[PDB]
Ligand SMILES: *[C@@H]1O[C@H](CO)[C@@H](O[C@@H]2O[C@H](CO)[C@@H](O)[C@H](O)[C@H]2NC(C)=O)[C@H](O)[C@H]1NC(C)=O
Ligand SMILES: CCCCCCCCCCCCCCCCCC(=O)O
């Protein structure tokens with residue numbers, strides 16, 4: 001006989017959403033992994049993606 | 050320096066009624082902790098671990 005604490009009142013999620021930026025192009029995998037010429041290791045090439 | 054002598058006494062001829070405060074703590078706040086919401090709040094994998 002008495003009063004007992006329990007877990008706090010939980011509310012479960014109803015659905016899942018995904019928010020990504022409006023991006024259409026594919027990344028240059030052919031330009032990076034299938035390039036005709038590759039740089040030397042002392043002058044390694046850095047490309048911004 | 051109390052004027053001590055072997056045959057001298059000091060006797061009050063009047064009085065003062067004095068009221069003073071004393072402040073005592075009695076209780077503090079009762080707190081409860083949900084462990085799952087503190088450590089692993091709304092995460093099922095953390096609760097399973
Ligand atoms: C005992 O002490 C009280 C309190 O200090 C004295 O009462 C005061 O007496 C003076 C002079 O008569 C008055 O101006 C004050 O208004 C009195 N104060 C209060 C609160 O009544 C009292 O006279 C003292 N008695 C003796 C015999 O010394
Ligand atoms: C053209 C480069 C695009 C840059 C993308 C950076 C984001 C990181 C995602 C991973 C991309 C490379 C994954 C390599 C694929 C390995 C496949 C395999 O195991 O055979």
Ligand SMILES: *[C@@H]1O[C@H](CO)[C@@H](O)[C@H](O)[C@H]1NC(C)=O
Pocket residue numbers: 030034
């Ligand atoms: C890689 O480059 C070569 C030479 O340009 C080409 O023949 C080949 O089709 C390319 N492969 C891909 C997957 O782009």
